[PDB]
Each structure stands twice: as structure tokens, then as C-alpha cells.
Subunit: 148 residues, 6 copies
């Protein structure tokens, strides 16, 4: 039972894919916990990409996301993190199978539409980093017991 951080990146937003991406997660049956449209701050972006702290691309990459806008979500369910990765596809859209977001919509990795958490450790950081705890929604799905 997990929560994963999913983020429509600026290219996703410019291309009008927010609704499509949300809907794919919703139909999959993960439970929505948090969502918001935003212009991120540089500090949040720099923490988000902390693992790439001192490499040549770091500045350009941070600039691209902090310029925004982005659409932020947290989704909940058994093996949510792996499911997010499955729905999104591989890092390179050219290697992504049709059916996945990247497979269906992306061309080059610089513009791969959407972020999904990579691991339990990344998910734990990302969920707390992008959303304050008052933004987490407690609710119960009448239909939930037929999903898991």
C-alpha cells in the first residue's frame, strides 16, 4: 500500500494533456489523494532534482521546471509506485510501448510529458516535498472494495 508522486511537466501542460493523464490514473483505480496546478519555486525544483546536484544539465533542467507551470498529484494504492511507472512508460518515449503516456504522446526524453516516482524512497520525499500535509485529502470510495 503506497503513494506515488505524479507530475505533469510543462510540456504536458502546453500540449493540453493534464486531463488525459489524470483520467488514465483515475481509470486505473488508484485513489486520488492530492492535486494542484502550480508555478513551482526554484528551491522545490532544486530539491526535487537533488540527485543531479552537480552535473552540467542541472541548471537548464531546474530552469525548465521552475518556469512551469506543472500539475501535481499524489495517487494511492497497492504498488502504486510501480503502477505509475507502468502507466507513464520508459524514460525515453521512443522506447515506450504504445498505450503508455510516453508511448502515446512523447517523442524525445527532454520532453517526456510527465514525471512518476521511481522508488519508495523517491516517492516518500516527493510526496512530502510537493504537497503540504493539509493538502492531503482523506475520503472513502464507495466503489473502493471492488478495486482492491
Amino acid at each position: 500500500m503506497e503513494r506515488t508522486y505524479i507530475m505533469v511537466k510543462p510540456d504536458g501542460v502546453q500540449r493540453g494533456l493534464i486531463g488525459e493523464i489524470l483520467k488514465r490514473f483515475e481509470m486505473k483505480g488508484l485513489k486520488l489523494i492530492a492535486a494542484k496546478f502550480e508555478h513551482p519555486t526554484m528551491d522545490v525544483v532544486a530539491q526535487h532534482y537533488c540527485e543531479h546536484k552537480d552535473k552540467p544539465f542541472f541548471k537548464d533542467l531546474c530552469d525548465f521546471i521552475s518556469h512551469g507551470p506543472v500539475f501535481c498529484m499524489i495517487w494511492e494504492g497497492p504498488e502504486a509506485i510501480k503502477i505509475g511507472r507502468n502507466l507513464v512508460g520508459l524514460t525515453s518515449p521512443v522506447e515506450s510501448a504504445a498505450g503508455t503516456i510516453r508511448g502515446d504522446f512523447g517523442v524525445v526524453k527532454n520532453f517526456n510529458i510527465v514525471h512518476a516516482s521511481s522508488s519508495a524512497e523517491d516517492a516518500a520525499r516527493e510526496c512530502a516535498l510537493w504537497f503540504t500535509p493539509e493538502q492531503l485529502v482523506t475520503w472513502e470510495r464507495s466503489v473502493g472494495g471492488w478495486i482492491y
Copy 2:
């Protein structure tokens, strides 16, 4: 040039229609300004429904929405308010034409999926009431000039 407040209500959320509704607004070409998933407070709900202040249904209605969850949006464009009404349909889904959200998904008015602002005055209140000003996103669509 207007902004309208659009809200997926609890029945919308339970039925898995957040993504579908967002996507219909996105494809229409209105520009997204603000969005968030939330559990509303009674005080916000009571202000939202202020025009029904002292009628028999007021308590039940406020309870239904404040129990939540809801999905909140603001959308921008020429005649956004009228466009929101067009996409959503008439108050009673049974009177709503197929193609509209209510036409395509709703059965009875108590469960009509989604709220759209009714008028310029309602929109002005609703946008400021549901969203703090730091939640409004400034951005520019590369494709915008082909929409309006």
C-alpha cells in the same frame, strides 16, 4: 475575457469523472488558471451557497459538499462563464443534451456531477472564495494565439 469557477462535486469524484471533466475544459481551449483537490470547510460551503441561506434544503446541501471531496478549478477565456455552462449543461441532467457533462453522465439534479459559475457576479465571488490569490497561475500558451 472572463474567469469561471468549475467544481467537480462529490458525486463526480466518487464516480471517477475528475479527469474526464478537466479534459473537456482543456480540449475546449479555455486556459487553466487554478486547480486543487480538497475537503472543503463548512464556512466556505456556507458562503458558496449564500443565496440559499434560509431555506429547508440548506443544511443537507452544505453537508453534502463539505463532507467532500471536491475538485476545484478556475478557467479563463472570452465568455468563459457561458462556455462553462454550455459544457456542463442544464441544471437537470434529464433536460441536458447529450454531449454535455450532465447530458452524458447525470440522471437527477441532486447528483449533477459538477458546478459551473452562473454569472459574472457569481464567478467573481466563487473564484476569490475557493482559491487564495497565490494559487492563481500566471503562464503563457505557445498555442494560445490559435485559440483566441
Copy 3:
């Protein structure tokens, strides 16, 4: 609280529209009670079109449906009958609005894809005529109380 009889006609079946039509009624929120794919008997068709018993086109119309195949459904809900008409469109496709089954898929009256009960009296007859009591399914939807 009503039950309406809905029938994908042979032109609809030939064109691969059974699923699309079932889906529209399902997405609308009506509760499915009954469904089967069949080659109808001439007796049932002749009863179905009994109001036209003594008219010129009667033979051709009966043969058309009895030759089949058809897909039969019963759908339940408040004002299901009116809702059926709303989803299907006007008798002639050139007059049906986009969004409806005929408006989206039909070209001429004789190939108008699908049948919906026209009134309470017709539905009462059609539901019992096309389906036996054994073929009516009693069940309870967990999400049902969010629809009506």
C-alpha cells in the same frame, strides 16, 4: 423509477456499434437489468411493430429486424425512458444533434442504428416482450447512491 428497452438494430451490429452504445448507457448512470445478443423470431418482431400491423412497409421492416442479429437491453432509473430518447436522438439522424447515438453515427431514418422505448406504455410492453422474467438481473451497485 422506470425501465426502458434499448435495442441495437442489425445496421448497428454490422457497423461494430454494440459496445459504443452499451458504454453510453452505462456511463450515463442507468442500471443494466438485462441484455442478450440474438436472432429474433418473426413473432416477437411482428408484436414489436404491432402499431404498424396494417401498413405497406410492415413486411420489409419486420424482415429486416427478424433477419437480425440484434442486441437487446433493459436499463433502469428515474426517467430512464426519457433518458433513453435523449441518448439516442430524434427518429431521423439528419435531425439528431451531435452527441446522440444517431447524431454521431446515423445518416438516414431506415438505418438509425438503435431503438429506444418511446413511452411508458411502449416500455412496459417491450421489456416483457423481448425478455423473460428469468433474464432480469437483480443486483446492487456500490456506487449507486451517488447516481440517484
Copy 4:
């Protein structure tokens, strides 16, 4: 039995709507006669829009369309012209109902995505003008006898 001229205008092409529009005509059941993607010539554009020869907005209207690109189509069927109009919606998208092309995707009237032949007279002119005799395709649909 008519032929109507349908043209995806530059805004339609910029917004990635060619397939969406083609698909809607195709699902409606009209028979495709001709199609091509092109940069139109100024001569053709001024001739197409000749009814507007002496008018303030003529030079801008022509420039917009001849700058291109456009996707040109011919569609065949009983009452094809009226049907084109039904699928597309009214001149102004704000006044176009959901389910039509303009109702689902348009906002303003300068950017209303697609053209449809207005009348029998207009259709005959437009077909002869945007297409050459040898671009018209003769073929027969196996399923066609189930459409009209």
C-alpha cells in the same frame, strides 16, 4: 445524394485536430471522396472567399488561410451538406452546442477550426475549386448498404 466540402483550417491544424475531425466524419458514415493536406494558393483562397471581395476583413481573412496549412476533404452521402453543418456546429463556437466540433473545441469565431459547405450551391463550387477531377476517388464500401 450530395457532396460537401469540409476543410480543417490553420487553427485546427495547429491544435492537432485533423484526425479528430476526420474521424468524426468517418464515424458519422458519410463516404470519403477526396482528401489532401496543402498550403493553399492565394488565387484559390480569394476565389473561395469571393462573396467577401470588397470588405474591411478580406485581406486578413485570405492571408490567414493562404498562409495555411489546411486539410481539405470531400464527403458524400444523403443530405451530406446539412450533416456537415450538424457535425461542425454554428459559426460562433460560444453558440455551438457540445458534441459538435466547434462546441467541443472552439472559443471564438475567428478561430472556429473547420469549414463546412453552407448550401448545395456553395458545395458544388467549393468541391470543383479545392480539388481536381482526378483527386476524386471512386470506391465501394462493403458495409455501405448498412449506412444508407
Copy 5:
């Protein structure tokens, strides 16, 4: 040339997925032979799942399916069985790729939405068992010679 048994399980029906699934089989081009919505009998269920006669999870598995409802189908085509498997995905949805039924809509394996015949042996058993000879529909597609 094969016939495969496809069954929308109770979770599928609860989640409003009957039309979605039918539509995917229909678009794939397999030919529909039989369909019905039913509350299955305990006798049929225990027989269908006989390979699991003596096992801890037998009594719960049968109860789940016989409580119902289910939507039953037969689909015909060259290598229909393997195709059913391809459309549906692997037993566990987490391991099912996007684009399949389970990959797009499933989360856990107890709630994996739909059954598909596993092998030729299984298909012949399942068809004879969930359907009676007179529920099988003989018909011919005009477009069928363009599919196989």
C-alpha cells in the same frame, strides 16, 4: 478458427466496464457469437472453477462469482483465444502492460475485472458450459471479408 469465452466479472460490472470491454473486443474485429448478463448459478460456477475443487480459496472464489452479476460473451476469429489473452493482459494487473484491459483498469489480482479462456481445451469447456446451443447466434458480417 476458434471461439473464446470472455466474462466480465462482478468487479468489472460494479465499475461500469461492460461496454468498454465489449467495445474493445468488437474493435479488435473478432466476431460476436453470444452475449448475456446474468446472475450465475452456484452449479455453473463450481464447475467452471473445477480445477480448484480442493483448495483453501475455493469457497470464497465461487461465492464471489455466483453472487454475481457477470456479463458472459463468446467471440469468434482466427486465433481468438490467444487474442482474448492479448486484449485482457496477464493474470496480475501490476504485471499487465498499458493498453490491455487489466493494464489500463486493474490494480490487484483478486479484482482483475474480466476472464478470458486460457487454452483451446478451456475455451470449448467454457463455451459449452456458460451458454446453451440456442444462445449462439449465426450471422454474417458484410465487412467481415476485410478482417480475415
Copy 6:
């Protein structure tokens, strides 16, 4: 940076799939350069299948396509050729994964709906063979820099 030739074959045209296919390539992000609907000449078909010049099935395959109709497209982008193969699926539909054109719509090799250039060498030949230089459209997408 590549151009790939994509062709809806007669079975695809007969089944109403032109729009669906155009839409998938458009949604993927490749830039449309060329498109037309046509009855192809035997000369062009024979060249198209020249690698099979001296084989038994050659006559039947040539007749099948030359009888037509076909819908021809050229699509541009980084690795367009590989992307074309990815969207279309494996040569045989029973082996193509759900999500692909063949995986979603095809049943057998001979009716596999659509053609995509197989390699750089094939694409270079196919683009010039099926289209004249005059039919290539030069244009610039406002949203283009968000795709690649």
C-alpha cells in the same frame, strides 16, 4: 530527424479507421508533412513491393493495394521511422501488443490495416515514390518546441 511513410491500406479504409490512425500519429507529436486519399496506380504498387518482385503472392498483393483505396501520409520527427513501427505494432496482429494499431484492430497478417516504413532506406524510397515534391507541406507549429 526523419520522415516516414505511413499508409492506411484498403482493409483499414473499409473499416473506418483512417481518422483513428491519423489521430494516433498526430497525438504522438510527429509533424504531418503530406497526406492524400487515392486509388493507387499498379506502377506505384509494384515499385512499392519491389523487394518481392519474383515471389508467388506478388500478383495478389499488388492487386489488393492497387484496387485500393489507400490513405497516404508522410510524418516527420526525431526517429519518426522507429516511432511509426512502435505505433503500428508487429507485422502480425496476434503478436502486436494492445495499444498499437494492429494490436487494437487487427486479426491476421493479410489484413493488418496499415503500413509503416520499415527502415531509413525504405522510407527514403517510399516518401518520394508515393508523393511528389509539390505535395510536401512546409509549415511551422507554434507548439512544436514543446515536442522536440
